[PDB]
Amino acid sequence: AISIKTPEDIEKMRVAGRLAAEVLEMIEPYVKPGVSTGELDRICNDYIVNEQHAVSACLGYHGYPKSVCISINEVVCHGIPDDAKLLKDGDIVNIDVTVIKDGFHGDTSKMFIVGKPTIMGERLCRITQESLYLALRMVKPGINLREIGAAIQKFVEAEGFSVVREYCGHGIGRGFHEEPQVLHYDSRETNVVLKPGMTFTIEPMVNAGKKEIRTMKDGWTVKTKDRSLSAQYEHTIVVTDNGCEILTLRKDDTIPAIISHDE
Ligand SMILES: [Co+2]
Ligand SMILES: [Co+2]
C-alpha cells in the first residue's frame, strides 16, 4: 500500500527528518578513537530521549536490543553496539538512526572515518555518498523508481565495486518500513512511477569487493562475505511537484535540501 503523505504529514516528517539528522550531527564529536559502540549507543538514546523528547524505532524492532545501529568496517548492517568494541583508526563506521516523533519516522545514516583515513576507506565512502547524491538528483515525479537503482548500480560497479541486493530502501512515514521497496539495483520486478507526496528512503550499501554477505550468530551483525569493506549512507526524502525535498539533510551535506527540476 503506497501512501501519499498530506502536507501536514510532511510537516511531521520534516521534523523526524531533522531530529534524526541532529543525532548524527550531535554524535560527530564523540566519534573518536577509544570509543565503545556501546557508549555511542548510550549518548544517542539519552539525546533522542532526554533532549529530543523523542523515541527510537530500532529498539525492540523485531527484537532489536539497541537504540541505533553501528556498523564497523566490514560489518554491513545491524551491527550491534557492544560496550566493549572499541574504535581503532582507519575504521569506517556507519551509524543508522531512526526516530519516531509524533507518529512519524525519520531514518538516516552516514559514515564516519576514524583517526586518519585509509585510502581505500575514503574512496569507498566517497563513492557511496556520490552514488546516493546521484540518486537524489534523479528523484522527480514521473520517473520510474527502477531507473534509480540501475543508476546507482552503474556508478558503483564502474569503480570496481559491488552493490548489495539483500537489503534495500523503503517507503517510510507512520510505518518504519512502508511500501515501496527501493532497490539499489536493476530488476524487471521494479516498476514504480513516482508521485508527489510519496516519502521514502535511499540507503545504498556498498562493498568494496563482492555483493555476497553473511549473517552472524548474534542474529544481526551482517558482514561482507569477502570481509571487504562496506559503506552506506542514507537519507529520508519527499517527492515534490518538480523534484525532491531531503528531510534528513545535515550541515555536512554537499547537496541542496531542495532539489528542483523546473525552469
Ligand atoms: Co536507516
Ligand atoms: Co532505512
UniProtKB/Swiss-Prot annotation:
List the catalytic activities from the record: Release of N-terminal amino acids, preferentially methionine, from peptides and arylamides
One GO biological process term is: proteolysis
Gene Ontology CC entries for this record: cytosol
Textual note on the cofactor = Binds 2 divalent metal cations per subunit. Has a high-affinity and a low affinity metal-binding site. The true nature of the physiological cofactor is under debate. The enzyme is active with cobalt, zinc, manganese or divalent iron ions. Most likely, methionine aminopeptidases function as mononuclear Fe(2+)-metalloproteases under physiological conditions, and the catalytically relevant metal-binding site has been assigned to the histidine-containing high-affinity site.
Q: Which SUPFAM superfamilies does this UniProt record tie to the protein?
A: Creatinase/aminopeptidase
Family matches, as InterPro entries: Creatinase/aminopeptidase-like (IPR036005), Pept_M24 (IPR000994), Pept_M24_MAP (IPR001714), Pept_M24A_MAP1 (IPR002467)
What PROSITE patterns does the annotation carry?
MAP_1 (PS00680)
**Residues engaged in binding substrate:** H78, H177
Q: Which EC numbers does the record give?
A: 3.4.11.18
- Give the record's keywords alphabetically: Aminopeptidase, Hydrolase, Metal-binding, Protease
Tell me which residues bind a divalent metal cation 2.
D107, H170, E203, E234
- Report if keyword Amino-acid biosynthesis is assigned: no
Domain of life of the organism in this record? Answer: Bacteria
Residues annotated as binding a divalent metal cation 1 are D96, D107, E234
Tell me its family: Belongs to the peptidase M24A family. Methionine aminopeptidase type 1 subfamily.
The record's NCBIfam families line, in alphabetical order, gives: met_pdase_I (TIGR00500)
Report quaternary structure and partners. Monomer.
Q: What does this protein do?
A: Removes the N-terminal methionine from nascent proteins. The N-terminal methionine is often cleaved when the second residue in the primary sequence is small and uncharged (Met-Ala-, Cys, Gly, Pro, Ser, Thr, or Val). Requires deformylation of the N(alpha)-formylated initiator methionine before it can be hydrolyzed.
State what protein this is by name.
Methionine aminopeptidase
Q: Which organism is it from?
A: Escherichia coli O157:H7
Q: Which gene encodes it?
A: map
